[PDB]
Symmetry: D2
Subunit: 443 residues, 4 copies
């Protein structure tokens, strides 16, 4: 049961030599990753049911075509593939076969350890994805949120979305469900009411995530950054403003990434508004969160972030006001509106981190350390926990090597565990499906 | 002199180019008795997205027309604040406001200000049909050469969530096939198809969704527009608003509705049975979720009784398969194109559709008029449904429209008479409509109608 | 040999009754005008300028209006073969063709009291709005240009360069839809639009049914408007223009320059902002000297406040206009006026009232210096239209056949100074395109 | 103002910082003289005498965080309107930046680019064309490449304006060598045509090369300037982008192109290709074409009159033909799975892709003999015309033919004899040099 999809959105003008490299990489051991990311995309609107599915790349003189063998029928309306899903499909080929292949094959001097190279790559990737619009006045609000979230948390984030869209702002989330879908959903409705024509709804994700988490159907720009170290850096550089909702260990982990970069002294003059918000009930959640930050980083971290409870209008209003300040801030520095080139991200924050049980129990989670190293290695630990929850390698590794164990001191490790268990009690650790098994053991 | 909230809105969408003498027309008509109407229509528009209860909270509101040499501007005094963002009027409400200005003070204003010699009135079905065209062209709803995608959806204002989601789902399939929606500019079944169609449009990167809302002054004064509408049109008569529905449409889908939705159907079915329209293609398809099976079965029995079992060659009833409902309309789009190509008719306005003058003639819901409705099978099915349409439109007057909402206790509640089995098959439907809350949204409902 | 033209640009959406109306209007005696205006449109340039002579070759032509349910179409019977590319009517001509259906059969046919100066003006707005010429929310860029239907190649070159400069400053041009001066600026402005990547060129040709039937549209025009009177065509020219560049011309260009100056010198329009520049190519020195020498003491001495003369600086001329734009935009905000239409300009009913030459009417011309500056220019405009009527306008040509040259009355050295102007027009070969000699329909003194 | 800072327009709009760096290194390298001279030329669209009239001119690359700007020291006063660079000049300027410093720099200093493989040289030409956003995707064929002399009389210049008009009347675009005479009048005529048919979005490409551009500024009609590295690859891009060629009356070069074409057309694997070649002239041209036809038939084969067609003084027919052929290409493309914008399928033989160093030793080893296969013939026939063209404008070749000896070539005498009659006629046609100063042969 075979369908020949032509390119939409991406990979339209391919050279004949590139077409050959795409076909090679698609026969390589990368196949399954390119398969699954491609089956996920075809299944936005929620893997093991579609074991018949297989996607073959097809060489034509002009460019490439994708062949869909036993694809999921709901991605087709009267025969034709839904345009959005078709384009996400080709975005996966772009950022899986094209991107992730090319960075290993070859490229003369791609250090991949020079934090310069690393940032220029994240620029390149966004550029190839046609996501850095030239002469674009700043409108993008990177939203961060938890994937399992309450109907009230959802209804609240939809309202924040709607107010953002009523102020002609665009959204960039994790390409996923719950809080990454609901701001897009709400913004769309505002855009409409204000006759906004061209909505951008970027979804920023990574290969391991997108294999088990389809995009939400709202995304119209799908970027698969290779590692969360890049995905996170990409979040920061493209955004002109961040709103961190109630999330789990992922959303938590992103916060430390921000705060690691924002506290740096080099970025004392950079302009990137951070606003943690939530509904009236989230107030307790933020309490703990905030105290946890104060204690790990200082009262000096509260200067970079602001908490608004149960005022979505103001939350949007604040960002719509900030946008003229992100514009001027980039104008003075001679920076790009698209890409926050000037922001100083620390090699300790860009360096890929492999979440091995060893690495997690040698984390420098001690107060005798600079705040940078603390939040950096904090984040490192928050990524392993995201590992044992969703990423395939982690969910298996915890059930075969045993939970992650963590070092540190108490009050530090003490308070965090109060976060972690608190997260579970809110069920933001795992989808409502079944229950949750801690992949972590904190003293 | 007291504390007031002032804003000035510049024309968006309509009334952008205005000669100076026209500007004088509008200002005069806005001092005319038409003010109160104009005011409450513009109030209803502002209150899109939030029943007279809302309108008795904005009694401080007043809308004043401003002259400038170039054209016009609209002054909002104590406007509802929920219609502004950071002090700026939401663009959509801004255009709908200037739609109201067009269709109430320009359109309906020039009409209200014409002679009505009842000795020699222009009952000409050509006027009513060229007029209906002229109204749509002024509201820029008639796009040259745009191929047929408009699907006119009908349904009750008060419907149950199961219906609402179904109309929503039907909407989704409709838009997933790059099809536009036209409705009654209202809540319930009149917004839920747009809501779902919207999502389909997105998934397919369908730019320029047209969600036209055909209403009428009475309805819109009391019922603000539903938020999904982008082209708002305020046709003067339910008689002309109906006819507009029919001509612009390239497909019709009737959901489960109360009196209004019923009355439109008879109006439609009447134009479909007319012989000159045996070669005209316009797909009519009633749909609803599973629970509406019964409703429609009754519905059918009423129609076949009033029209014959030959009615059923003009519609098709689909239950719980919104995908197919859209699939079919989508399939029928090419037919309507060629049907218009052959005859040389226009995509936008069905000029060849013969609509009968007794279907185009307005029916004042006088209680005397109402019982004089010849509801007898000896008459052509044409005249049977014409009067049957007219009866169904009276009940809606008693329920929503001002004249007859209160004109009913004064001059008395409505009473219809004719063939008894006809009146009987009506009561099951009407009294069924009461049990489905398709008459009124409910907390309270008065019959406003009486049959032996 | 028949071909079927569907509507392009205008008369796209039409109600069945309207189509019905156009059908009858086409069967009326207007047919000749409607077919005559249609024939010029279909000839435009095509490397032939013969006034009426070229058109005599197409005596078999005929255009019938067709009625379809959707709208209207146009039937071309024996149409000039040069208006077709491999069978397809060239789109510009097709649009200009359909503009004649709009403005001859729809507009002109249907002609509200037309002596009320208010109704007149709002009629002129309604004609322009119909041709979608008053665009909404457009910063001012329109420089109306006036000139001569006949001009040596010297002036043509200059006005291309003026037009090139003008275009190079993202300025659109508007003329009288004719040749020579009414084409050159567009020809260059277009070039200039290219270099500065200005995509939406707007080259408006505004004309009357009297002129279009004998002077076809130059092919540069992409917005054609056929206003009914020269009186209404002029009124339009003024309202839509945000600047005006007068080149050298004959008696027609002359007719405008008094029209305009009359309106500007009126007191109510002292605060209005409309930059008037006269430019010529160096050799125009004397022509502009004798023109200025004429105006100074025929009309007011103070009238040199309302025009600036520039010779052989095409750059500066366009620069000045490109600076004037923001002032005109400010002048409209302050008045709360529109950019597209200058409503506030007080145009006198004496400048709105059509003029029929005859001969008594030329005798009853109050050309006296005692007369107000205004009254003087109103009838001074009229005098020139006489010479423009019997020059080319068929009604006037026949009228100078029977009763001969118009007897221009007036008085004062005013008459002698008209004569040495008029003598120059003919002596400079700006009164008739080269082909025969010229027969003065004017008898001064 | 004597200094002005021009922003990127049309190219080089989105640049990564590592890129912005490499550009300045290349501006600091000896390439500057080329980049200066091409940028002077671009700015003088409105003869190498004007090069010595602007000696103080100098153009510098400004680095910014966002991207690059261009610093213009003492530019020709004619390029600015009220101080603002003419939008079109500005974009030509940045195409010089794109194609001299980015393209020309990067390929010479690399090496995984073999540049000796005909698969490489071909995909490079695709690449540069894509990079200059000139290969439009999903564009129905309309691109009519027009070849012809730079020194052509007023009858030919006017005729090509007519064949240009007629092409525009029929909504066809034009591509030439960014030059005067025949390379301008078509575009001049074509654009009137596009006006008359309300054709918006005209395309007027100009393929040229660094040695050419620096002494011959682009004509003012060109809106896409493309500067391919050499004449060998310039021609390849000519061919491959074009859906139809018209060869006007030209000299050497217009000579050199035709043998290039014919070499590729007569080659067997290209007998199924669809690319009309109409050689047209204005009636007095009959004699020049006569001599031309007699020449090829002998020098190649009477089997060559299959690939070209001669029309004289029928501009409307020349256009009429090409418009009919525009659909025929589409099928020829759609069948093979080829791209409408690039003619991937055509087999250009490597002998025609390999740059020919116009040296005297090399000019001797030109197999100019009728025993060789018509393919081999052509290739070396072309190489010979690259030699003479060098003698005329190319710096390398004007220097080599100065005191170091005019270019000398021989072979079969009938062949040689045909040549001297042609070349002699070119001199007599003043197609070899523009001005009336008598021309001195390099042959
Ligand atoms: N600074 C900045 N400019 C950008 C960016 N993306 C596009 N641009 C535009 O590039 C233009 C460059 O103008 P400048 O800021 O004065 O130049 P700079 O780069 O800062 O250094 P320079 O002084 O030349 O040496 C701006 O036009 P204007 O500001 O003059 O007018 P407007 O925004 O209204 O359109 C911007 O609109 C960006 O990320 N940062
Ligand atoms: N008659 C009519 N035509 C419409 C309508 N909407 C779009 N069109 C188009 O306008 C074009 C005019 O077609 P005609 O040549 O005039 O049809 P004819 O029957 O031959 O003569 P007639 O209309 O009676 O005067 C149509 O065909 P095309 O040129 O596009 O090609 P195509 O027709 O192949 O689809 C349609 O595409 C409409 O409501 N009515
Ligand atoms: N004068 C004029 N204005 C128009 C026209 N069409 C829209 N407008 C808008 O009207 C604005 C005038 O400014 P306002 O202070 O708000 O006055 P208005 O309410 O519009 O009328 P009012 O003058 O008070 O009677 C301009 O915005 P700006 O703030 O940018 O002012 P600008 O472009 O002039 O620099 C225009 O954008 C028009 O045809 N003429
Ligand atoms: N060959 C070609 N196709 C292009 C190009 N750009 C887009 N396309 C489109 O890609 C479609 C390919 O359809 P396919 O089913 O795959 O059939 P083929 O063309 O034979 O290629 P295939 O062998 O399957 O790989 C074409 O549809 P149609 O063939 O029906 O043509 P159109 O719609 O434009 O009128 C084109 O519309 C291009 O540069 N070249
Ligand atoms: O917070 P979780 O939902 O538990 O983990 C994934 C998140 O990590 C990132 O910040 C994205 O916003 C994701 O939403
Ligand atoms: O309650 P109902 O009157 O039945 O619902 C309102 C509908 O009746 C009218 O015809 C309009 O089409 C509306 O869609
Ligand atoms: O009659 P001419 O003076 O020779 O030229 C025609 C002029 O008369 C009209 O007003 C046009 O705008 C032209 O300026
Ligand atoms: O001026 P000529 O030297 O005679 O001709 C040179 C041609 O060869 C090149 O392809 C260019 O496009 C030119 O058209």
């Amino acid at each position: 049961m075979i369908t020949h999809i032509s390119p939409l959105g991406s990979m339209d003008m391919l050279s004949q030599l590139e077409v050959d490299m795409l076909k090679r990489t698609a026969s390589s051991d990368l196949y399954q990753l390119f398969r699954n990311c491609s089956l996920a995309v075809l299944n936005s609107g929620s893997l093991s049911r579609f074991e018949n599915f297989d996607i073959n790349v097809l060489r034509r003189e002009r460019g490439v075509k994708l062949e869909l063998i036993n694809p999921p029928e709901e991605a087709f309306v009267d025969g034709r593939i839904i345009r959005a899903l078709q384009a996400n499909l080709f975005a996966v080929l772009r950022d899986i076969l094209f991107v992730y292949g090319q960075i290993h094959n070859r490229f003369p001097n791609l250090n991949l350890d020079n934090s310069v190279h690393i940032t220029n790559l994240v620029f390149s990737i966004l550029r190839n994805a046609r996501a850095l619009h030239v002469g674009e006045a700043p409108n993008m609000v990177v939203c961060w949120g938890g994937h399992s979230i309450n109907e009230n948390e959802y209804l609240y984030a939809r309202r924040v979305g709607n107010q953002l869209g009523l102020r002609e702002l665009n959204i960039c989330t994790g390409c996923g469900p719950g809080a990454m879908e609901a701001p897009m959903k709400g913004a769309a409705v505002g855009h409409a009411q204000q006759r906004y024509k061209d909505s951008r709804f970027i979804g920023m994700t990574e290969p391991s995530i997108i294999a088990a988490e389809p995009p939400n159907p709202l995304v119209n720009e799908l970027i698969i950054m290779p590692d969360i170290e890049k995905r996170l850096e990409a979040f920061v550089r493209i955004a002109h403003g961040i709103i961190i909702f109630p999330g789990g260990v992922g959303t938590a982990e992103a916060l430390l990434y921000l705060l690691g970069i924002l506290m740096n002294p080099a970025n004392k003059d950079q302009v990137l508004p951070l606003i943690l918000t939530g509904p009236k009930e989230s107030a307790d959640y933020f309490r703990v969160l905030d105290e946890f930050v104060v204690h790990t980083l200082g009262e000096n971290a509260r200067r970079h972030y602001r908490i608004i409870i149960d005022d979505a209008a103001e939350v949007a209003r604040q960002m719509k006001k900030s946008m003229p300040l992100v514009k001027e801030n980039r104008r003075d520095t001679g920076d790009a509106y698209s890409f926050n080139w000037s922001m100083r991200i620390a090699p300790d924050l860009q360096m890929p981190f492999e979440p091995s049980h060893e690495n997690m129990a040698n984390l420098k989670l001690y107060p005798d350390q600079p705040v940078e190293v603390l939040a950096a290695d904090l984040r490192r630990a928050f990524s392993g926990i995201v590992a044992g929850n969703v990423k395939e390698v982690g969910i298996r590794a915890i059930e075969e090597f045993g939970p992650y164990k963590i070092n540190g001191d108490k009050e530090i490790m003490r308070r965090m565990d109060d976060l972690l268990q608190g997260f579970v009690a809110q069920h933001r650790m795992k989808l409502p499906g079944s229950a949750y098994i801690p992949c972590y053991e904190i003293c």
